[PDB]
Amino acid sequence: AMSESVPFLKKPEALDSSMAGYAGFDPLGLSSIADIKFLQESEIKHCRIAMLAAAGSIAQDIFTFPGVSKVVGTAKMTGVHDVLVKQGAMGQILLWTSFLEVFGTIALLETLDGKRAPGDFKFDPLGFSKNAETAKRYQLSEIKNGRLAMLATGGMVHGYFITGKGPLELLTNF
Amino acid sequence: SQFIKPYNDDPFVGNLATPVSTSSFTKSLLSNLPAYRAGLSPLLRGVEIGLTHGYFLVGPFYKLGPLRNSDVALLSGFFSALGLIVILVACLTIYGVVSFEETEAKDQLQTAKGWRQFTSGWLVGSVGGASFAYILISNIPFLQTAGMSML
Amino acid sequence: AKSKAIPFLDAPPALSESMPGYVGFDPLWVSSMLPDAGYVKFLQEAEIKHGRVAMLAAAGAIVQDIFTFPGVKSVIGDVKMTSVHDKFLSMEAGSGKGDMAAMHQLLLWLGLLEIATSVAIIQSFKGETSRGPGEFGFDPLNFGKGNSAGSDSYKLKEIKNGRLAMIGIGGMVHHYLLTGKGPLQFLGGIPNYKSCVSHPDSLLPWLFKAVGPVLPKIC
Amino acid sequence: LSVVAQSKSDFEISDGTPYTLNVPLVGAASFIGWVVPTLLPSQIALYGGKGLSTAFFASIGTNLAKFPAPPGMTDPFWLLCFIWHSGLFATMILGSIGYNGYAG
Amino acid sequence: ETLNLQIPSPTFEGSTGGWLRAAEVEEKYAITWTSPKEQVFEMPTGGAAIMRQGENLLYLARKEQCLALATQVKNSFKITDYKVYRIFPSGEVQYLHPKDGVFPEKVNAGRVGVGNVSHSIGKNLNPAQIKFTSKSFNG
Amino acid sequence: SHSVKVYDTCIGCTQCVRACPCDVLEMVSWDGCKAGQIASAPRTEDCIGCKRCETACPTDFLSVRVYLGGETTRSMGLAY
Amino acid sequence: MTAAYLPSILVPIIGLIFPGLVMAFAFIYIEQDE
Amino acid sequence: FGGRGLGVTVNAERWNGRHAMFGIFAMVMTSYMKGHGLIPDADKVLDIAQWGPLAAVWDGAGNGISNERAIILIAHVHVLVVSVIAAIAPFGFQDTLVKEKGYTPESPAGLIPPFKTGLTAEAELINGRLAMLGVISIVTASLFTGTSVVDTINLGMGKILY
Ligand code: CLA
Ligand code: CLA
Ligand SMILES: CC1=C(C#C/C(C)=C/C=C/C(C)=C/C=C/C=C(C)/C=C/C=C(\C)C#CC2=C(C)C[C@@H](O)CC2(C)C)C(C)(C)C[C@H](O)C1
Ligand SMILES: CC1=C(C#C/C(C)=C/C=C/C(C)=C/C=C/C=C(C)/C=C/C=C(C)/C=C/C2=C(C)CCCC2(C)C)C(C)(C)C[C@H](O)C1
Ligand SMILES: CC1=C(C#C/C(C)=C/C=C/C(C)=C/C=C/C=C(C)/C=C/C=C(C)/C=C/C2=C(C)CCCC2(C)C)C(C)(C)C[C@H](O)C1
Ligand code: SF4
Ligand code: SF4
């Protein structure tokens, strides 16, 4: 019973192979401090927010919406946050994501109690996971892209703190 | 619900089962401290306690001692820590001489051999931790000030 | 029960003949200094870890004398064998003032791996794991033919070469600390102190204070 | 987070009494229940046109910009920090009492 | 006669005033008594406890604590069915009070007088006559 | 321990025995007094030295006399 | 002062070592059963 | 008490003998060492401004300890710290300064131990008695001759050192 990802460490006790995205990676023992289901809900939340953040970074390089260049002149990655707190955009997304978080808080309490799976909000309108063979593939895939997007979001915003270019402009102007 | 109950089911012992005394967090901390941790020889208990205590002893002597404004402040602070260590080891040894009868048991702290092991480990770890603190403060200018090098 | 390495001396009680790189050499009985079951295991992991780090250091000194990677020469200049450590640290945030994090990046990733090895050593000490010393499971190309631990002969090769590299890297470091030449110039310059390279004082100059007024100081 | 709302841990508030500290729900609900009213703006020199939560968060960012230097004695950071955490601890205490005790 | 260790104790919520390490390594005292009711009394070591209907048992550190409770129950609840024991860490139990089944203030046959001096208190010996002598000052 | 003496001026009033907090004293039979009984001190190892017996005694100078002596765990009244 | 090194030798010994040694040995002597 | 191998025992005899042999070596080494002036700034008087009142001496000129005394003192402080650590936490094989008290004492040697030229206990005890006798001899010789102990050692050894 050894960890798959870290061969010299004992396999984490709280963790199990039924979990999506499991690789046996908890060398510090944080799965015992906080409840594992809270940690999974937290991880999947972080995953989705950073997936949006990373794609938004890339797309805000690729194009901007009509009239956006009027309001944001030279601000690129996090400067647009600073100028659009003055405008109403940040207050708006903050208000509506906080609205969603209220029901997310109810759902987190529900999944702590045990009725709901972490990150499961029954949001499958296009019926991608109806077959259920894809569901498991989609579950593992979502966790992997989420982790990659967490690392990527950090690595782009820190590349922008260094150069000011932003992701695609950092790449094209080496 | 009530959070205060008789200690270890006994209403007539001189203790209470309060959250500070007997919660899960307290029991985890107490059970994992080197004095009480399972599977440790008394010498290893002495080493871990000594390393901790010797390391923090260096700092008050160095920052606030008589030679603090001299360039020998770290030297005087280490040697003052050493002097306190030697006096405390004398205190541990005389406690062991007068408190424990001589029996073969050596794996418990409260035996004559177990106390002598703990004292040996405590002296070695204490001088080791003081030496480590000396090395860290000697080399890193952040530690020489209170973090005041950044301003 | 006498010892192989020293026939007249009595064999050290804690060491077992089933441990790689054992010739009965422990006159000071450092292996008996802790009564615990996993202290012998701890010391064996320590010896292997020190040996591997020394082997990298010995190889690094020889290669640095051979060549350097592109662009390094324009930053560090003419510094070799621990002077480059001080030179990088003079241009790094926190330790100095500059635009580099070369020693700091090494500290970061080596420290991440090394907290992982910390948990491995702690588990191995208390008997919670049936893992031997030095084995981290790292063997990507099959060299031990099915076991990452390797054969008895190859771990004996590893331990002896590690001990050799500890002695050698200590020698190379001190010969640089006084001649300033570096490994290949020192080994070429078998008459030495005759002409030496002007090299900076290290980050610990005090240790170079008995060389002048007490010890001869031929240089 | 020594124990969450779900019946998962064995954390006993004392020797033999298990008690679910609802650290996620109480911390989240107390934070929102204290921060949202505190958004109320006020044209006072301490607030500067913001609410107490928003002027406090602004003074965190301002002092973090000058990261090694601490805020001065006359800086609004200390008074904002005090009142904010005072009402926050009071709302966590009252929230823990309400949620753990009344359970609904 | 011997202490039946299985007797239920009075309901009590615990206190810091109870016995310490010297009780389990030197001696402990026990008191047993019969109550007609389930009623509140005051513990010698602290607050209030409730004695159970039937037979009760306590452990105290001092003999005086056992006798202070015994006087309190006798005056307050008219209970004289109390027996005080001394218990050693070897497990040996020593019956103490009332020592011969009869209270000390009531006379009993077979009691031998200890400490009785045949003269009045002013007839004692001056210290000088018994100096460097083993002879006692009581005549 | 403390040493407790009963002198033959005791009138057998039993006041010392009722006043003793540690059951040191008891009543024994004696023809000397009108009450037919005298105090006795069989359990002086339990004497704490409170001298409540001496306070209770009504003879002119006390028939019961406590002489404080060597201290023990019992005579020091130590619950530790 | 002649033999001026003597106060700097004897005063720390008399003031610190001598009481530390008598306190240690008096402590041992007064707390031994035999 | 003194049944721990302390007092006039053969254990104390052996320990004092080992210290005297190191001491004869240390006296020879410091005599040779200060004869050639290899102790740096030996005459330079330490300043109370840097070291505090522990450096004061009250000799009329300078009023402070010399650097040579300080350097020799620190050398002996090195071996005192080793000494304390070896007394309280000795090696596994090392002869202990304080005995169990249930131990059986080594047999007293007598007038001269049996002559064993090895790394033996007899050689150690013979050389230890000889070194302790050397310590007293050098002290008394230096006191009556009026010379310093370093010069006395140099003259006794025939000015090999300086
Ligand atoms: C954490 C994520 C995040 C954050 C804080 C921001 C913040 C910002 N964006 Mg970026 N953006 C994001 C993600 C993000 N964006 C994503 C995912 C995309 C598309 C790939 C973009 C594309 C984008 C463009 C093109 C522009 C911005 C702009 C802006 C600014 C104003 C807001 C606006 O007009 O948004 C517009 C953003 C969108 C319409 C994308 C929303 C995507 C939604 C939320 C995905 C959810 C879909 C799903 C079906 C809903 C299910 C709900 C579920 C919970 C049940 C602001 C600084 C503007 C600006 O000033 O740039 C300089 C601008 O021109 N954003
Ligand atoms: C500061 C915020 C605040 C306040 C004033 C109250 C007040 C109240 N709550 Mg609520 N509650 C809060 C936060 C708060 N709660 C949060 C954050 C949660 C979620 C975790 C809950 C969850 C909750 C539940 C589930 C229930 C209550 C109930 C109650 C009522 C009685 C029980 C109680 O807590 O006694 C508090 C008693 C008083 C406030 C009155 C005493 C008067 C003195 C002066 C108290 C003052 C204390 C303090 C100085 C006030 C600080 C205010 C502000 C500056 C921070 C009382 C009206 C129960 C109830 O009756 O149902 C409606 C109930 O079932 N609450
Ligand atoms: C293990 C593992 C793998 C791996 C790997 C790696 C990187 C393995 C690296 C092995 C290395 C680098 C070994 C180097 C040892 C050096 C020694 C013994 C020399 C000491 C010097 C001496 C004695 C000297 C000297 C000198 C003196 C003092 C004076 C000087 O002036 C000069 C002079 C030089 C003459 C791989 C990745 C294949 C995967 C695999 O599945 C598991
Ligand atoms: C303040 C500011 C704002 C902002 C902002 C934002 C968006 C800030 C976002 C910051 C983020 C997302 C930082 C993430 C950093 C990732 C790290 C350190 C991971 C390192 C990986 C490690 C150590 C190892 C990883 C791993 C590898 C390699 C090997 C080891 C194992 C493993 C763990 C798998 C605004 C918006 C207000 C604008 C305003 O103008 C300024
Ligand atoms: C980066 C940094 C620096 C650095 C640095 C480094 C890398 C310093 C490394 C120093 C090392 C490794 C020194 C090694 C000494 C080894 C010795 C004396 C071996 C003795 C073995 C013996 C006697 C064997 C005896 C024996 C043999 C022969 C046969 C018999 C048996 C046996 C008993 C085994 C600084 C500090 C300079 C400063 C700089 O600013 C920053
Ligand atoms: S002194 Fe106190 S304990 Fe002793 S007999 Fe008199 S009343 Fe009883
Ligand atoms: S001694 Fe005093 S109190 Fe006691 S019975 Fe005699 S007369 Fe009464």
From TrEMBL, chain B:
Annotated chlorophyll a 2 binding sites: 37, 48
Residues that span the membrane, as ranges: 72-98, 118-143
Matching InterPro entries: PSI_PsaL, PSI_PsaL_sf, PSI_suXI
Protein name, entry field: Photosystem I reaction center subunit XI
Name of the coding gene: psaL
Compartments, as annotated in UniProt: Membrane; Plastid, Chloroplast thylakoid membrane
UniProt record, GO biological process: photosynthesis
Residues that coordinate or bind chlorophyll a 1: 35, 53
From TrEMBL, chain E:
Keywords for this protein: Chloroplast, Photosynthesis, Photosystem I, Plastid, Thylakoid
Compartments where located: Plastid, Chloroplast thylakoid membrane
Name of the gene encoding the protein in the UniProt record: psaD
Name by which UniProt lists this protein: Photosystem I reaction center subunit II
Keyword Chloroplast included in the entry's annotation: yes
Predominant location category: plastid
InterPro entries, A to Z: PsaD, PsaD_sf
Function: PsaD can form complexes with ferredoxin and ferredoxin-oxidoreductase in photosystem I (PS I) reaction center.
Family per record: Belongs to the PsaD family.
UniProtKB/TrEMBL annotation, chain G:
Bilayer topology: Single-pass membrane protein
NCBIfam families for the chain: PS_I_psaI
Keyword match Transmembrane: yes
Name of the protein in question: Photosystem I reaction center subunit VIII
Cellular component terms per the entry's GO annotation: chloroplast thylakoid membrane; photosystem I
Top-level taxon in the UniProt lineage: Eukaryota
Transmembrane regions listed in the UniProt entry: 6-30
Keyword field: Chloroplast, Membrane, Photosynthesis, Photosystem I, Plastid, Thylakoid, Transmembrane, Transmembrane helix
Gene Ontology biological-process annotations: photosynthesis
Entry similarity comment: Belongs to the PsaI family.
Protein location: Plastid thylakoid membrane; Plastid, Chloroplast thylakoid membrane
Biological role: May help in the organization of the PsaL subunit.
Primary site of residence: plastid
The organism of origin for this protein: Rhodomonas salina (Pyrenomonas salina)
